[PDB]
Design a protein around this ligand. Structure first.
Ligand SMILES: Nc1ncnc2c1ncn2[C@@H]1O[C@H](COP(=O)(O)OP(=O)(O)OP(=O)(O)OP(=O)(O)OP(=O)(O)OC[C@H]2O[C@@H](n3cnc4c(N)ncnc43)[C@H](O)[C@@H]2O)[C@@H](O)[C@H]1O
Ligand SMILES: [Mg+2]
Ligand SMILES: [Zn+2]
Length: 212
Protein backbone atom coordinates (compact mmCIF):
# COMPACT_ATOMS: atom_id res chain seq x y z
CA UNK A 1 0.00 0.00 0.00
CA UNK A 2 1.86 3.06 -1.31
CA UNK A 3 -0.01 6.08 -0.06
CA UNK A 4 0.32 9.85 -0.23
CA UNK A 5 -1.71 11.96 2.17
CA UNK A 6 -2.19 15.56 1.06
CA UNK A 7 -4.02 18.56 2.44
CA UNK A 8 -3.44 22.09 3.64
CA UNK A 9 -1.66 22.87 6.94
CA UNK A 10 -3.76 21.59 9.83
CA UNK A 11 -6.10 19.36 7.78
CA UNK A 12 -5.17 16.36 9.89
CA UNK A 13 -2.56 14.56 7.80
CA UNK A 14 -0.52 13.58 10.85
CA UNK A 15 -3.56 12.68 12.89
CA UNK A 16 -4.91 10.40 10.17
CA UNK A 17 -1.47 9.08 9.24
CA UNK A 18 -0.82 7.71 12.74
CA UNK A 19 -4.07 5.75 12.56
CA UNK A 20 -3.40 4.42 9.07
CA UNK A 21 0.16 3.29 9.82
CA UNK A 22 -1.07 1.66 13.02
CA UNK A 23 -3.62 -0.43 11.12
CA UNK A 24 -1.42 -1.35 8.15
CA UNK A 25 2.02 -1.55 9.71
CA UNK A 26 3.91 0.71 7.33
CA UNK A 27 6.28 3.68 7.78
CA UNK A 28 4.74 7.13 8.33
CA UNK A 29 7.03 9.46 6.36
CA UNK A 30 6.39 13.14 7.12
CA UNK A 31 8.77 15.60 5.52
CA UNK A 32 7.80 18.13 8.18
CA UNK A 33 8.52 15.67 11.00
CA UNK A 34 11.86 14.70 9.44
CA UNK A 35 12.85 18.37 9.21
CA UNK A 36 12.07 19.04 12.86
CA UNK A 37 13.90 15.90 13.96
CA UNK A 38 16.83 17.27 11.99
CA UNK A 39 16.38 20.61 13.76
CA UNK A 40 16.39 19.08 17.25
CA UNK A 41 19.56 17.13 16.49
CA UNK A 42 21.00 20.35 15.01
CA UNK A 43 22.16 18.48 11.91
CA UNK A 44 23.37 20.53 8.94
CA UNK A 45 19.99 19.66 7.41
CA UNK A 46 17.95 21.12 10.26
CA UNK A 47 19.81 24.44 10.13
CA UNK A 48 19.14 24.79 6.41
CA UNK A 49 15.45 23.84 6.58
CA UNK A 50 14.78 25.88 9.73
CA UNK A 51 15.35 29.16 7.85
CA UNK A 52 12.40 28.33 5.60
CA UNK A 53 10.22 26.54 8.12
CA UNK A 54 10.35 29.35 10.68
CA UNK A 55 9.06 31.75 8.01
CA UNK A 56 6.35 29.37 6.85
CA UNK A 57 7.96 28.94 3.42
CA UNK A 58 8.71 25.74 1.52
CA UNK A 59 12.15 24.16 1.97
CA UNK A 60 13.91 24.01 -1.45
CA UNK A 61 12.90 21.06 -3.66
CA UNK A 62 16.52 19.92 -4.07
CA UNK A 63 16.90 19.15 -0.35
CA UNK A 64 13.32 17.94 0.13
CA UNK A 65 13.35 15.53 -2.82
CA UNK A 66 16.78 14.38 -1.72
CA UNK A 67 15.76 13.27 1.77
CA UNK A 68 12.60 11.56 0.53
CA UNK A 69 14.52 9.68 -2.17
CA UNK A 70 16.89 8.37 0.50
CA UNK A 71 14.14 7.56 3.00
CA UNK A 72 11.90 5.69 0.56
CA UNK A 73 14.89 3.50 -0.22
CA UNK A 74 14.98 1.90 3.24
CA UNK A 75 13.82 -1.67 3.78
CA UNK A 76 10.81 -0.69 5.88
CA UNK A 77 9.16 0.78 2.76
CA UNK A 78 9.26 -2.56 0.88
CA UNK A 79 5.52 -3.27 1.01
CA UNK A 80 4.03 0.15 1.55
CA UNK A 81 4.51 3.52 3.18
CA UNK A 82 2.48 6.64 3.86
CA UNK A 83 3.91 9.94 2.60
CA UNK A 84 2.66 12.91 4.63
CA UNK A 85 3.23 16.46 3.41
CA UNK A 86 5.16 15.35 0.35
CA UNK A 87 4.97 16.14 -2.39
CA UNK A 88 3.55 19.62 -2.02
CA UNK A 89 4.62 20.99 -5.42
CA UNK A 90 4.31 19.50 -8.92
CA UNK A 91 8.09 19.37 -9.28
CA UNK A 92 8.23 17.20 -6.17
CA UNK A 93 5.42 15.02 -7.57
CA UNK A 94 7.20 14.50 -10.90
CA UNK A 95 10.45 13.67 -9.13
CA UNK A 96 8.56 11.26 -6.88
CA UNK A 97 7.08 9.46 -9.90
CA UNK A 98 10.57 8.74 -11.27
CA UNK A 99 11.98 7.76 -7.87
CA UNK A 100 9.20 5.24 -7.30
CA UNK A 101 9.47 4.04 -10.90
CA UNK A 102 13.11 3.12 -10.25
CA UNK A 103 12.32 1.41 -6.95
CA UNK A 104 9.35 -0.30 -8.55
CA UNK A 105 6.93 1.01 -5.93
CA UNK A 106 4.46 3.35 -7.68
CA UNK A 107 1.76 5.20 -5.73
CA UNK A 108 -1.49 3.35 -5.01
CA UNK A 109 -3.60 6.21 -3.64
CA UNK A 110 -3.37 9.96 -3.17
CA UNK A 111 -5.83 10.96 -0.46
CA UNK A 112 -6.58 14.67 -0.24
CA UNK A 113 -8.05 15.74 3.11
CA UNK A 114 -10.23 18.76 2.33
CA UNK A 115 -10.89 21.34 5.04
CA UNK A 116 -12.11 24.93 4.94
CA UNK A 117 -9.46 27.56 5.67
CA UNK A 118 -11.36 28.95 8.67
CA UNK A 119 -11.35 25.52 10.28
CA UNK A 120 -7.65 25.17 9.47
CA UNK A 121 -6.82 28.40 11.31
CA UNK A 122 -8.53 27.30 14.52
CA UNK A 123 -6.92 23.85 14.45
CA UNK A 124 -3.47 25.44 14.29
CA UNK A 125 -3.81 28.10 17.00
CA UNK A 126 -4.86 25.56 19.60
CA UNK A 127 -2.46 22.76 18.75
CA UNK A 128 0.06 21.16 21.06
CA UNK A 129 2.65 18.62 19.97
CA UNK A 130 4.75 16.05 21.85
CA UNK A 131 8.44 16.82 22.37
CA UNK A 132 9.49 13.16 22.03
CA UNK A 133 7.18 11.49 19.49
CA UNK A 134 5.75 14.45 17.57
CA UNK A 135 2.12 13.37 17.94
CA UNK A 136 -0.32 16.29 18.11
CA UNK A 137 -3.27 17.32 20.29
CA UNK A 138 -5.75 20.20 20.28
CA UNK A 139 -6.76 22.02 23.47
CA UNK A 140 -10.37 21.98 22.27
CA UNK A 141 -10.94 19.30 19.60
CA UNK A 142 -8.53 16.62 20.86
CA UNK A 143 -7.00 17.43 24.29
CA UNK A 144 -4.43 15.26 26.09
CA UNK A 145 -5.90 13.21 28.94
CA UNK A 146 -3.44 15.03 31.20
CA UNK A 147 -2.84 18.68 30.24
CA UNK A 148 0.74 19.38 29.20
CA UNK A 149 1.92 15.78 28.69
CA UNK A 150 1.74 13.25 25.84
CA UNK A 151 -0.69 10.36 26.42
CA UNK A 152 1.73 7.83 24.89
CA UNK A 153 5.22 8.43 26.28
CA UNK A 154 4.44 11.17 28.80
CA UNK A 155 6.65 13.83 27.27
CA UNK A 156 5.86 17.53 27.67
CA UNK A 157 3.58 19.06 25.05
CA UNK A 158 4.58 22.30 23.39
CA UNK A 159 3.30 24.78 20.84
CA UNK A 160 5.12 24.40 17.54
CA UNK A 161 7.24 27.46 16.82
CA UNK A 162 5.68 27.93 13.39
CA UNK A 163 2.18 27.80 14.86
CA UNK A 164 2.29 31.49 15.77
CA UNK A 165 -0.62 33.32 14.11
CA UNK A 166 1.56 35.30 11.69
CA UNK A 167 3.34 32.17 10.49
CA UNK A 168 0.15 30.12 10.28
CA UNK A 169 -1.06 32.75 7.81
CA UNK A 170 2.03 32.48 5.60
CA UNK A 171 1.87 28.67 5.61
CA UNK A 172 -1.77 28.56 4.56
CA UNK A 173 -1.12 30.97 1.69
CA UNK A 174 2.08 29.26 0.57
CA UNK A 175 0.39 25.87 0.38
CA UNK A 176 -3.02 26.89 -0.93
CA UNK A 177 -1.53 28.24 -4.17
CA UNK A 178 0.23 24.92 -4.83
CA UNK A 179 -2.87 22.72 -4.56
CA UNK A 180 -4.42 23.15 -8.03
CA UNK A 181 -1.35 21.89 -9.90
CA UNK A 182 -0.93 19.01 -7.44
CA UNK A 183 -4.57 17.93 -7.59
CA UNK A 184 -4.49 18.17 -11.38
CA UNK A 185 -1.34 16.05 -11.56
CA UNK A 186 -2.82 13.25 -9.46
CA UNK A 187 -6.29 13.45 -10.97
CA UNK A 188 -4.50 12.93 -14.29
CA UNK A 189 -2.58 9.89 -13.00
CA UNK A 190 -5.85 8.68 -11.55
CA UNK A 191 -4.53 8.15 -8.00
CA UNK A 192 -6.61 10.98 -6.51
CA UNK A 193 -9.36 10.43 -3.95
CA UNK A 194 -10.83 13.23 -1.83
CA UNK A 195 -12.19 13.03 1.71
CA UNK A 196 -14.08 15.51 3.88
CA UNK A 197 -11.62 16.33 6.64
CA UNK A 198 -14.18 18.53 8.41
CA UNK A 199 -15.57 15.77 10.62
CA UNK A 200 -14.44 14.20 13.88
CA UNK A 201 -11.28 12.06 13.85
CA UNK A 202 -13.19 8.76 13.61
CA UNK A 203 -15.42 9.85 10.73
CA UNK A 204 -12.49 11.11 8.68
CA UNK A 205 -10.63 7.88 9.41
CA UNK A 206 -13.81 5.98 8.63
CA UNK A 207 -14.12 7.63 5.22
CA UNK A 208 -10.44 6.78 4.73
CA UNK A 209 -10.52 3.20 6.05
CA UNK A 210 -13.05 2.12 3.43
CA UNK A 211 -10.64 2.90 0.58
CA UNK A 212 -7.55 1.08 1.86
N1 LIG B 1 7.31 18.56 0.91
C1 LIG B 1 7.78 19.70 1.46
N2 LIG B 1 8.36 20.64 0.63
C2 LIG B 1 8.86 21.82 1.06
N3 LIG B 1 8.80 22.12 2.37
C3 LIG B 1 8.25 21.26 3.28
C4 LIG B 1 7.73 20.03 2.83
N4 LIG B 1 7.24 19.33 3.83
C5 LIG B 1 7.43 20.05 4.92
N5 LIG B 1 8.04 21.22 4.59
C6 LIG B 1 8.43 22.32 5.50
O1 LIG B 1 8.08 21.95 6.85
C7 LIG B 1 7.11 22.84 7.42
C8 LIG B 1 6.29 22.09 8.44
O2 LIG B 1 5.82 20.87 7.80
P1 LIG B 1 4.54 20.12 8.43
O3 LIG B 1 4.91 19.57 9.73
O4 LIG B 1 4.18 19.05 7.46
O5 LIG B 1 3.58 21.28 8.46
P2 LIG B 1 2.22 21.45 7.88
O6 LIG B 1 2.25 21.35 6.42
O7 LIG B 1 1.93 22.83 8.28
O8 LIG B 1 1.11 20.56 8.42
P3 LIG B 1 0.65 20.30 9.83
O9 LIG B 1 1.48 19.36 10.57
O10 LIG B 1 0.68 21.54 10.61
O11 LIG B 1 -0.78 19.72 9.81
P4 LIG B 1 -1.34 18.29 9.67
O12 LIG B 1 -2.22 18.18 8.49
O13 LIG B 1 -0.45 17.13 9.91
O14 LIG B 1 -2.22 18.32 10.95
P5 LIG B 1 -2.40 17.62 12.36
O15 LIG B 1 -2.73 16.20 12.11
O16 LIG B 1 -1.29 17.99 13.27
O17 LIG B 1 -3.67 18.45 12.91
C9 LIG B 1 -3.63 19.88 13.24
C10 LIG B 1 -4.48 20.15 14.48
O18 LIG B 1 -5.84 19.75 14.20
C11 LIG B 1 -6.30 18.75 15.13
N6 LIG B 1 -7.17 17.81 14.37
C12 LIG B 1 -6.83 16.76 13.60
N7 LIG B 1 -7.90 16.15 13.07
C13 LIG B 1 -8.93 16.84 13.54
C14 LIG B 1 -10.31 16.61 13.29
N8 LIG B 1 -10.77 15.62 12.51
N9 LIG B 1 -11.17 17.50 13.91
C15 LIG B 1 -10.75 18.52 14.71
N10 LIG B 1 -9.43 18.71 14.93
C16 LIG B 1 -8.49 17.89 14.36
C17 LIG B 1 -5.05 18.16 15.71
O19 LIG B 1 -5.22 17.62 17.01
C18 LIG B 1 -4.07 19.34 15.71
O20 LIG B 1 -4.14 20.20 16.86
C19 LIG B 1 6.39 23.38 6.19
O21 LIG B 1 5.60 24.52 6.47
C20 LIG B 1 7.60 23.59 5.25
O22 LIG B 1 8.32 24.76 5.69
MG1 LIG C 1 1.84 17.07 10.36
ZN1 LIG D 1 4.60 11.75 22.71
Amino acid sequence: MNLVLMGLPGAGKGTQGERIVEDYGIPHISTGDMFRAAMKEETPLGLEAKSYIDKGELVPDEVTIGIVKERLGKDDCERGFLLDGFPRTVAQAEALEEILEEYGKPIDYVINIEVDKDVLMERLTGRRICSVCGTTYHLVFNPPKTPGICDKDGGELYQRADDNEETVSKRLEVNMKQTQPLLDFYSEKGYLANVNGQQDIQDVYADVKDLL
